[PDB]
């Protein structure tokens, strides 16, 4: 099976690549975009207002080859703010395609 330490190593490389992307990717066409971020699980780019933002299932997942075409989703509202889950401070997120 896939070990914890191999998954941790892959996660650190994913985080490191994401932080390079966050710092170096050119800015969006307007601050009306939702802002790029790393939520500890996936790397989110800038989001167009009023549309869904999809990112490939994180490639460090132990079962990554079980979901090679899956996507995790956020929604960027018309206000340029990530859609939030009520009863929490966290943005709404659909990861169902990246489950085991």
């Amino acid at each position: 099976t896939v070990s914890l330490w191999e998954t941790v190593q892959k996660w650190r490389e994913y985080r490191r690549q994401c932080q390079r992307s966050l710092t170096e990717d050119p800015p969006p066409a307007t601050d009306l975009f939702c802002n790029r971020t790393f939520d500890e699980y996936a790397c989110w780019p800038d989001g167009e207002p009023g549309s869904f933002v999809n990112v490939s299932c994180p490639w460090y997942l132990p079962w990554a080859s079980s979901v090679p075409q899956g996507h995790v989703y956020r929604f960027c509202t018309a206000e340029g703010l990530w859609l939030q889950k009520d009863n929490s401070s966290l943005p709404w997120r659909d990861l169902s395609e990246c489950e085991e």
């Binding site: 099976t1 896939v2 070990s3 914890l4 191999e6 998954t7 941790v8 996660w11 500890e40 699980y41 997942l61 132990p62 990861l95 085991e100």
Partner: peptide, 26 residues
């Protein structure tokens, strides 16, 4: 899932999965 090595392999696989679940809720 009948032999000792099935349990030990399951235990090792769970360590990685709990780490994912920590990232998710985190």
């Amino acid at each position: 899932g009948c032999f000792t090595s099935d349990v030990s392999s399951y235990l090792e696989g769970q360590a990685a999965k709990e780490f994912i679940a920590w990232l998710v809720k985190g």
